[PDB]
Amino acid sequence: HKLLVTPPKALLKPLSIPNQLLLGPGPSNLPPRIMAAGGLQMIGSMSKDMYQIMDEIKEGIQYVFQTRNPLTLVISGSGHCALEAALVNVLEPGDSFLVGANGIWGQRAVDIGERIGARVHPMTKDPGGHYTLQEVEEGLAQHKPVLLFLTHGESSTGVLQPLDGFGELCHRYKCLLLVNSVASLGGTPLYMDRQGIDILYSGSQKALNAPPGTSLISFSDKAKKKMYSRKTKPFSFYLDIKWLANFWGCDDQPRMYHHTIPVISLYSLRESLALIAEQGLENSWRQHREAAAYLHGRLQALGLQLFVKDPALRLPTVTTVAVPAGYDWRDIVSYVIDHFDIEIMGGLGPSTGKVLRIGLLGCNATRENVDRVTEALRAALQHCPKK
Template sequence: MSTLCRMRRNMSFTWKSLQKFSLEPTRPLTTTRQIRVLDNNVGKMTSISPPPECLFKPMNFPHKVLMGPGPSNCPPRVLGANALPLLGHMHPEFLLIMDEVKAGIKYIFQTNNEWTVCVSGSGHAAMETACLNLLEPGDTALVGINGFWGERFADMVDRQGIDVKTMYRPMGEVFTFDEIEEALKKHKPTLLFLTHGESSGSTLQPLEGVGTLCHKYNCLLLVDSVAACGGVPMFMDKWEIDALYTGSQKVLSSPPGASPISFSDRAKEKVKKRVTRVRSFNFDMNHLANYWGCDGDVRRYHHTSPISTIYAIREGLARLAEQGLEESWKVHKQCAELLQEGLEKIGLELLVKNKSSRNPCVTAVKVPDGVDWKAVTEYAMKTYRVEISGGLGALVGKVWRIGVMGYNCTPDNVSLVLRALDEGLKTAGYSKL
């Protein structure tokens, strides 16, 4: 039996078998009076406050169907992996799991890059890793802003004191090839940032040919695919993308906290030839690449990895591998079209007019005039425990955002969110007639 098969068998736990790993029952709080202890440092009695009563009660975590732009619900196998016993972060068994995660990332990115790792943290951590490693004083970053995430990256660059140039499109629109080339000619940047799946505007930025264009102007291409990768086609090497990252909590349907990122040879060389040190020790790819076994050297301790989260993303990657990328892309497209057709039947207007620019993973739909957007989302949550999110940035109060990703990407979930939204609109007094 292969190592991979043995690991999969070992992870096939039922909820009952996992209960033995649960915490002991909480004990009732018996006193609220202050406790007096001897403070050896000052040689006198001192008082400490009692523990908070809330910690003696069970957590409240009702099951909800997360149909917003993320996180997605986790399948049982991912939740089960997250509950497995801990290993040490330098144990050979855990390093093997890290290697399997690395192989899974290369698969979903369609890359052979050596520098492929999982950053400890949410998608923001991966974004900042790319920013801190690929840019240094004297560089210029060109940031495509057509939503919230371009704005966020521009802010990160500015905080480093690095020159930021921007190109803009309204939320719900994407950049054309000609617009990108014109901006590259004008600003001569070191790095171009584009958001592949812009969850705030629900767009899908075309990327084919952009990497080649960037290299023509001696520029690196950095892509944020947090809200798209795994649910839409991605060919990192073929499209000549120099740095790409995603999140664990979207299509991979794993808990947030481990974010895949990959650097091309060009990007790796840029990091290696820096004049200044990477300003963050935690996000320095020189160290991360070693810890993840990417440099051929003996692995050295860098930080304590989020072990349980790595277990979980490993199973999220395994689940996607078993489904197959092409099948995943097809299912996400089908469910997105089912959702969008249903929204139009209710009488709602989609934000993105051009069908080819729509992100199958996140759909933004306009809030009708006179409708309280929040009242509708509260109805969906109260009645069906279904999450429908509001807008971000300039679209706050103007759109709802519905995510159909990973484990949640099913026709039944699409029907559920449509029913919840339709009833919520009627309750708010809206009629398409």
Template structure:
């Protein structure tokens, strides 16, 4: 007999408002992705589901622009993919150079240290990017086995140029890891052409899927380093040896490793299909055009973009400085109350200094840009009128 009663909260239907998610993520699901989430479950070893896994792998190879065999989706959010990169590639004592210009470099440093790596940092303020010369200087000084860069730094709104970084790493015998959670599909990225050894992203940004299945890929050089490990990775769940087999990447009969998030993989397959139908180049162009429309509108309102140089602005997430005397949170709450639109604050170094506006995947449309600009202007005007009336 049960010793406690059922919670009253669970005895009524779930209710929540529809919101337009124009923050740094997640983005809203497209109707097609939402419908895919509701498809009947299959067993995680059924041949029909294995076929879906194979199609997801092909889709990841396409959006990453890679031919890497070891390409799959981690069962977890983007943080799980980040952790998988750390725990598989790094061994205790390995020197890793982290290019830190925002929250995600800080986060990767923490994860690498927890895996026993010797973490060296080259740091720049949020809103800045690194040049190949700066990275080469730091690599020469520290002699790392691995270098980490964030392609789309959503806390500071920067798009890190990557062309030439792989050449630097090859010249010094180290591997290049890149975080593309906020950028994949929204800005050009070429894993093989640019010499990236480990690349990962999330499903909830440009792919407009629910978080929970995160694409990742490893080069042949990264595979060689992992094969030469002295000890197994600390995580069984994220062990790439097991996952490579489960995803059919090693040419051997598949073995059960874990129960995949089946509905998430349905959704990811559909999100990849939508992007493939649009085409990568057209998707990149759409995000750039929407970002430019947003930037022009913000500047017309007299607001200041956080990232100075247009070529270094991340198309998918735009930080804009909060004007003096304005409470960023009050404006965000006004926009949510009156428009049901999410407008996020800063993160880490940019906390309380900026709003962050996300235009990703299904949400990256000119209509949403115009709605956001109208809502933001109204919110700022409302906040200013309250300040003036209190004087």
């Protein structure tokens, strides 16, 4: 009868984790209140008290997105899981789908779109670029899409995509606007209803400083109508918006068991939303803008070059630096964690090998942290081998 697999020796040792100052494109470090919420005991996942916390979270999401949309809720997964929830519900097989492919995030949207049978049309742009109204209109006119995807904060390239006017333009072409604000939310201006966005989503782990694992999403009535009139069922059950809507209190029926929400992660997310509700959006935008401007000045004084030349196009939360000539970017990243216990990153997708990425996210977006990463980079530039 004897078990062949034995208790793993490594698990018989205590868990211990290193102390790391996370100054990459995210996830970010957690403030005390969010760590404390993470250590709390479970409550019933369909209890009145749980529903009250969920309702508070929904109010918080409506605040940070600046929307009145009733159909606003949490997706029980990471930012990719929220994008897939948007696409698997809004798009039916054969639907035309226009995508701003200007970095890895647009590429990921193309991949998901293809998999669920859309007719996908990328607008491809080198890393560093953004879309104009004219570029979008040309795509809308040519491809007659039911949905456009735009990345607001392109954290792979350091770009801040302008959003004014795009929603109205899409709507003239009978197109819904979907916007990724995972890296932008809380760090730079964003107004869902004022900007005519139809589907907006973000993640817990960037400027909100919650642990990775949950994501935030909201749907206009136009998007709501399309999702509820579909004649095909979405390919996913877990992400079916009719079930999720009901369980999050968004429709007129009693909440029915769908899947078990991540109770403890929702405590933490609730607290992250309370913190930014206390600080205020505009104050948070100012904090990130100023920290970013300070970082840009210090990096240039090190002799590094910002990847995005035009300051109005720079994403405050994630700054791209050209890799300095003669260095191997891997040495610089390794040097910084090895000798300073600071995380930064290289590039990602099309910016792989071209940039270093430095994040300033929420409570970590400070002049004091700018000074730490500046000194770490200075030392890497002094000691890493140069060709």
